[PDB]
Amino acid sequence: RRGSFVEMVDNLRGKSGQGYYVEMTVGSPPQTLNILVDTGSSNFAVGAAPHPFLHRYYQRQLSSTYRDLRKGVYVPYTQGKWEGELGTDLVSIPHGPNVTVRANIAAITESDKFFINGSNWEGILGLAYAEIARPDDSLEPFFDSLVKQTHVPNLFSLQLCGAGFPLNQSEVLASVGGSMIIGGIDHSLYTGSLWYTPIRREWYYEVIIVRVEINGQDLKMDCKEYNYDKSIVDSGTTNLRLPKKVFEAAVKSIKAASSTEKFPDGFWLGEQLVCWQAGTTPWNIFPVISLYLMGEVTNQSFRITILPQQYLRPVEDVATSQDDCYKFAISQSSTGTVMGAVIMEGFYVVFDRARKRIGFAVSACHVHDEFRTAAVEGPFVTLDMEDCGYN
Numbered sequence: 001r002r003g004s005f006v007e008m009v010d011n012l013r014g015k016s017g018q019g020y021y022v023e024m025t026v027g028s029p030p031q032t033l034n035i036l037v038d039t040g041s042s043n044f045a046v047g048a049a050p051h052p053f054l055h056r057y058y059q060r061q062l063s064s065t066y067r068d069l070r071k072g073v074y075v076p077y078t079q080g081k082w083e084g085e086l087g088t089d090l091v092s093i094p095h096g097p098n099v100t101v102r103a104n105i106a107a108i109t110e111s112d113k114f115f116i117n118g119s120n121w122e123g124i125l126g127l128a129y130a131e132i133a134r135p136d137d138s139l140e141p142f143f144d145s146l147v148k149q150t151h152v153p154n155l156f157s158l159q160l161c162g163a164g165f166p167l168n169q170s171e172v173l174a175s176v177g178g179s180m181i182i183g184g185i186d187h188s189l190y191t192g193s194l195w196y197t198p199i200r201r202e203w204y205y206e207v208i209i210v211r212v213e214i215n216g217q218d219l220k221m222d223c224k225e226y227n228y229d230k231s232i233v234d235s236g237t238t239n240l241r242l243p244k245k246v247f248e249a250a251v252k253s254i255k256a257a258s259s260t261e262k263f264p265d266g267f268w269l270g271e272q273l274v275c276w277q278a279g280t281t282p283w284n285i286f287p288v289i290s291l292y293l294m295g296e297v298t299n300q301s302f303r304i305t306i307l308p309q310q311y312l313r314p315v316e317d318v319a320t321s322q323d324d325c326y327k328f329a330i331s332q333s334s335t336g337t338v339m340g341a342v343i344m345e346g347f348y349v350v351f352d353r354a355r356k357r358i359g360f361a362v363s364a365c366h367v368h369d370e371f372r373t374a375a376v377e378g379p380f381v382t383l384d385m386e387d388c389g390y391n
């Protein structure tokens, strides 16, 4: 396999806890900003005023190409809020396609628990569809503009690369965190075959899960439960998030599989770190988790399998400690399944918008051990898969 997108390989930095970001420029002359790659939202929004956690921000007054749309936007969400002023400007991705686009930009003027101290990013690139744009679906998302204005194919792909150990801010800045290939698939970024699941509807990147196993054991829930009220692929969420009832069942199963060691309730609630002596993390006691996804062929599914090296997120205790420490990166949701960054770190994920499908392959950068790897495998005969979708 040849890698045909060398200019875009290794263009991301970051980590699952704080997000993966790409360098972009906005305005004339170009203003460089680091931008979070977010497949779970649809606005391009950048810091545009001083904030304690921003080293730089978009200065509209210094851009000759800035256009004011004379419209505000207020975006409250569960864990925070941002508000800003809409406009358009010329945008480029230096380690991207060799093109400049005029795109909508929300200039963020006030925010709460949005920016992350030490994350290094100064804005967000919402890569999902117009239906979920704010303030409404008339605000064309960045990727839509890119495809309309250029010859870039209507597809992008993400390889998010977790280190398998903690990185500080200085280390993140100096390290490669993955690849966003805009307009194509780079065959150097995965091993084995790509398997595709349909995009159920173009809003979020919505998919359908048809079976869940923990170490090969069927969780045995009605498949609608896995997709209640949706299942999405979201690079802008850290954890694998599961609907309450599925979370409860899965945690019970994972506890049972790992029962040779007892962990505190705070660990399973995703709040508390657990630590082992350097090098002694007992990966083998934790189970693999398989999610079966609807295939493109009638009555066919395939599965993706992750390791504890994906769902246990490395965290530092103290800079002086030599212990290997982790948080449990599966958590409950009241808004459906979210296949977040820790899941995506296992896989090369192809967002094939043109063909309304998402591809998964084993990532060439996934963390594993001598005994087990992540997997993407198929096919399986599966009936009545459409019925697994929630209405």
Ligand SMILES: NC1=N[C@@]2([C@@H]3C[C@H]3NC(=O)c3ccc(F)cn3)COC[C@H]2CS1
Binding pocket: 368, 369, 370, 371, 372, 373
């Ligand atoms: N694909 C295969 N899978 C196996 C294990 C899961 C792979 N890991 C390795 O080969 C390996 C080698 C050196 C190292 F530092 C870390 N890992 C499981 O079955 C046979 C073994 C070799 S080939």
Ligand SMILES: NC1=N[C@@]2([C@H]3C[C@@H]3NC(=O)c3ccc(F)cn3)COC[C@H]2CS1
Binding pocket: 015, 016, 017, 018, 019, 020, 036, 038, 039, 040, 041, 077, 114, 116, 124, 234, 235, 236, 237, 238, 341
């Ligand atoms: N995908 C959504 N996107 C939003 C972005 C801001 C949040 N994501 C993050 O901070 C973040 C943190 C760690 C990661 F690995 C990835 N992302 C934007 O809309 C609201 C918020 C909710 S979840």
